[PDB]
From Swiss-Prot, chains A, B, C, D, E, F, G:
Cellular compartments annotated: Cell membrane
Family: Belongs to the CALHM family.
Intervals, Cytoplasmic compartment: 158-257
Region of interest (Intersubunit interaction), ranges: 165-202
Tissue: Placenta.
Gene: CALHM2
Section of the entire sequence shown: 207 to 306 of 323
Signal peptide residues on this chain, from the entry's feature table: none
Record protein name field: Calcium homeostasis modulator protein 2
UniProt function note: Pore-forming subunit of Ca(2+) homeostasis modulator channels. Mediates ATP release from astrocytes and ATP-induced Ca(2+) influx in microglia thus regulating neuronal ATP and Ca(2+) homeostasis, synaptic transmission and neuroinflammatory response. May form intercellular gap junctions. The gating mechanism remains unknown.
Protein source organism: Homo sapiens (Human)
Length: 257, 257, 257, 257, 257, 257, 257
């Protein structure tokens, strides 16, 4: 926000297409960053590559809700600082309350230019005041819309997701824990396999304390093959088997065999 | 409050609809935030989704009382700082004590504009003084109304809730304790289940001290199924069984079986 | 006090109804806060909801004495700073010692306005001096009245309360101790009940050191039912049974059975 | 002293009744505070409610001597700073050494007003000098009177009190020690009684180390009844029984039975 | 000294009675404070209430010598700073070396007034110089008189007191030690008696470590009665019994029985 | 960025070939540095020197994605600071909205020169404003293109790489671990061989603690010969043997013999 | 760089031979320092004094690559700061775009002289701008050439050296380790020999702890003679004997006997 100096094209047609630009595009960027920086995007890409609409829509509407939080605050802070709409809806504030070509020209010259004629068209500061007024008004209205939508979507999306609230918490915590344990175990298993491979070539492997302990405790020969490995990955449905639930594709493949 | 500069539309019709805006909308936002940030909102949504009016109304009037505290202080601080009503009830202070179109125009130009004519209509500072006077008066009156309502609702809402005072304290503390213990136990049970699932795939699971201790102490095979799980959730009535009370749906389902 | 700038309506009728406002209403607010922030208010509400006039009047006159201490200091500091009465009794200082409409107008313009004519009516600073004089005089007189009332009520209210002084101290300390022990025991009993409830559902409950010790030391099955529970609450009379006294409804219900 | 700005009514009749006010009333306030803040006031109220003139007069003249120390220093510091008498005896300094209405008016305008005519009546600074002179003189004279009275009352009040000096010291120390031990023992006994009461209701009482030790060491069932309790309280005479003295009503009731 | 601004009455008769005032009265105050703050004053009051002239005069001339040290330094510092005599002996410095009414008036106006005519009467600074000269001269002379009197009284008062020097030291140290031990033992004995009294009423007494140890070590039942107690107090003569001396009334009453 | 002062050739033909230079060449430099500083470049050079298109293309598109991150941020920050395009597209902003040789000359003189005529051609600041506008617009558009390409390539390149996501993580971690262990073991084996060589010449080898321990623990005689050594190096295919996978050429050569 | 103030000969022939001087000679100095400060230069001198072209060329092209890094950064920073070419190509910037003797004279006077005529020849600042432009352009072009050459030589010089990459790392680490161990062992062996020599003369040798330990642990009589010693030194070929490699002449002489 700092290294990007907001400046205005004092032009009769390039304001409408610049205020809306600086108001909409950075939100889109923060939004798409909310996806790329997240990791479950790859899970969803896999799922749509190769389960029913219920749980899929649930994870969709959870990822979106988790990502929408950057553009909300950005739009809020900018639309409230006023400068955007000032630069944007300047070619249209009616002269009836405060050469068409020259009219539009000077009106576009209004915002933060001080090349303004300051003449019988409009005074300088009164126009800035009116525009910052309408801007801040729309900004508060937008923040209201966003928060009331957050409330209503809380309710109606706890209606969407098939599980109740407590299972929601349990499922979230389980996904987190399984992911972390899988990461760490994968690292350790990999280090062991690499140590065995190197040892079979050189004759020994220089290891510090903890690595030597990990080699001693968990000997490993061969990692799971590719078919089952591929069978693991993906986003899982809550597969409510008769009497027992399933929380992740790993859990399904485990209980199944 | 800081990054939102209060500015006035010096216009004959846009003041009445802007002062009241900046006075009412931010209260509504803080209020709805008082719900969204709270968690029992989901409980109430579930209850109204699928117990009698007494305890439900009690939790309603407790949540509301816990949420009303932000708009009270916001309205108080703003209405007392004066600027709001100044900008709001400026088109109406009668000239009889201190072209109708020009009259309303200059009167709307009065607040914090200094484009004020400063002429036989009204002096500059005397109008600001009168308006800040009436504003601060209404502000103290409002704070009085709010606090006396807090007192009277203390009394009459201790009349509303069916339990007496000591049971009120006991019930609050029990809800808090059960919620926290449920959170922690859910986390541990989930970590154990995930560890078993991963181990059945890789061959082992790398764990530090405390996690290994938690795996050793509390072995787990299968979590409660979905019907009873759903039977848990919700807001509970104080179900006064003959001789023994019930404080939470968990307690009801436990004592029942 | 800081964020509330004292300003004056230089008006012939709005001073008398503003000085007295800023002098009386904030005292009322601090007073009612002295009740709401206190907890025994609920006890008294219960007592008047459903014991004799002696001990009830005693607790009444003790709560009041404990709450009156905020408005005393507020009235003192304001009435002594002078500005209040200055702004208040300005329409009446007689011109005979230092158009009726214009008279009252300029007199109301006297305080802290500097739109004062400063003319043959009254000089500027002499009026401020006279008013701050009468104000500080009334302020010292009021502080005297308050402190002498505190002395006389000390004496006559040690006459009111049926117990003597030493029993007064003993009773106060007993109420404090019983309240604190009840709070803590309620918390522990509740945590135990919640732990049992959760354990009966999951299969175990993750607890740290002290919580595990509290579960081990004090097993609990079922809390007191509702009739006796309700029989506890309230404000108690000093029930002087023949030979043995009673200090709290808890004590009465205990010695009785 | 700081938040109370000394200001003068430059008026022909309101000075005599304002200097004496600011000189006398705050002493009265500090004096009565010397009683209210003390605790033996309740003892004396009880004694006069329901022992001979000797010891009663002794405790009276000891309490007074302990309370008179605030107004002494206040009167001293104010009367010496001079401003008081300056503002007070200004309507009377004779013109014969340094329209009667105008005379009194300007003389009252003399102190710290600078609306002073500064004319053939009196010069400005010479009057201030004369008044501060007479003020400081009376102030030193008053401090002398106070200290010489303290000396003479030391002697003659060691004549008043029936006991000699060493017994005076012993009696003071005994009253202090008995009061402190009574406070602490009352607290402990009360906590024990409350613990028993709570335990008989819940089933147990959560206590930390020291509280548990106090419950273990000093079991208690029933506190002294009301008649003897009332027999304790009061201010005691030095009741010189034949061969053995008594120092407090507690001591009398103890040795008596 | 700081909060007391020295100011002068530039008056023909009020200087002689003000310089001497500020020179003599504060010495008297510090002197009488030297008695009141001392404790042996009560001893002497008792002795003169109800032993021979030798030891009594000795303690008199020791107390006085111990108390005279404040006025010496006060008189010295003031008389040397000069301002006092300047303000005092100003109506009399003879014009013959450097309307009688006007003469005395201007001469009284001389000191630190700057309303001085500065005219053929006397120059301004030369009079200040002469007066500060005579003042400092008298001040050094007075300090000389005081110190030489201290020397001569050392000699002649070691002549007054009946004991020689070494016994003087021994007697002083003995009085100090006996007084301190009496204070501490009185405190402990009193605490023990109060503890027994309280215990006989409540049933026990809550005590910390050292207090419990003091109760265990020194059991006490009844303190010395009033006749012997009164026989103790007073100032003692060095009662030279045949072969053995006595140093305090306590020692006399002890060796006697 | 700091030590490189951006300066403009105010010339009619040398601007188009300088702005684009400073915009494109430093990106190329940071890009090629992204390769040279990486180590796998040598692996790829070996692979193309002497496995199928799938895994090779995968490592290619991973290295590129890891290296493209410097020019993205550089182009973004420069194109957004504006100065570049300002200096670049200055010979072309049409005069129709805000001697051909002189036209182009002054237009090239426009940017940051202040030798600008400032005449009927164009004003000074309006041209800077228009150019910074179009520049920042293109900059935001470019950042959008880059981030949306990052998203789409995330998806489609998880389509490219033959392994699924979890194997992707496992393979990355395995490559890292094997590389680090190979480095350390190579160092230790080398130190041992050098120690033996030196000892066979001098008669002994001075070693500290850890080096002596490494000599004692892992004796070594002869390192792997050149044919197998060369057989190791390279980038490996994921060689999915029937039932067991291979993750590195080291792993292939190990499992093979 | 700091203590060497860049100054220009404003002369028609001494600029071309001074800019190129300050641009080329310091690079040559840093380059030759890159050799002298290195130690392998002596090895190469020995090798060329008295193995095949492959490994020799390899070590040559490694030493050069390790030494070329100083002139690269020096040329870059200077050519980019601009002053050099400014002072250098100043006699040639064509007047056709921005007495021949006077022409060349003033053109040579252009750079940083301010004796510049500033006349119809060329303006002052425009020439500086053009020259710094062309300078920075050539500087970026040169940095590009250098880095792309580094990339291409990475590839093609991993083609040059006969060993593959992993052996490259192993060989580098082995050379480092052998060199360090040889240094330390040489020091210790030498100290031992000197100690024996001194002892045989004096009768004893004063040694601290570690030196005494080194004498005790490693007794030594006679160091390797000169023929084999000379046989050691030099740069070694990777002598690939059938089945076993050789990494240093020390290794060859060791395995050979």
């Amino acid at each position: 926000y700092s290294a990007f100096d907001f400046n205005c094209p004092c032009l009769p047609r390039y304001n409408l297409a610049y205020g809306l630009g600086v108001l909409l595009v950075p939100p889109l960027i923060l939004f798409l960053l909310g996806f790329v920086l997240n990791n479950n995007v790859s899970m969803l890409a896999e799922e749509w590559r190769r389960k029913d609409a219920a749980v899929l829509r649930y994870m969709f509407c959870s990822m979106v809700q988790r990502a929408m939080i950057a553009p909300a605050v950005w739009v809020s802070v900018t639309l409230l600082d006023g400068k955007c709409i000032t630069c944007a809806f300047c070619t249209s504030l009616p002269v009836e309350a405060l050469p068409q070509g020259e009219v539009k020209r000077v009106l576009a010259r209004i915002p933060c230019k001080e090349i303004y004629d300051g003449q019988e068209l409009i005074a300088n500061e009164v126009a800035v005041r009116y525009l910052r007024c309408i801007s801040q008004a729309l900004g508060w209205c937008f923040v209201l819309l966003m928060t009331t939508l957050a409330f209503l979507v809380r309710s109606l999306k706890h209606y969407c997701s098939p599980l109740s609230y407590r299972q929601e918490a349990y499922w979230a915590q389980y996904r987190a824990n399984e992911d972390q344990l899988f990461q760490r175990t994968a690292e350790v298993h990999s280090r062991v396999l690499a140590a065995n491979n190197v040892r079979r070539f050189f004759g020994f492997v220089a290891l510090n304390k903890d690595d030597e302990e990990l080699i001693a405790n968990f000997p490993v020969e061969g990692t799971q093959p590719r078919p089952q490995w591929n069978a693991i990955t993906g986003v899982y449905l809550y597969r409510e088997n008769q009497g027992l639930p399933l929380y992740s594709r790993l859990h399904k493949w485990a209980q199944g065999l």
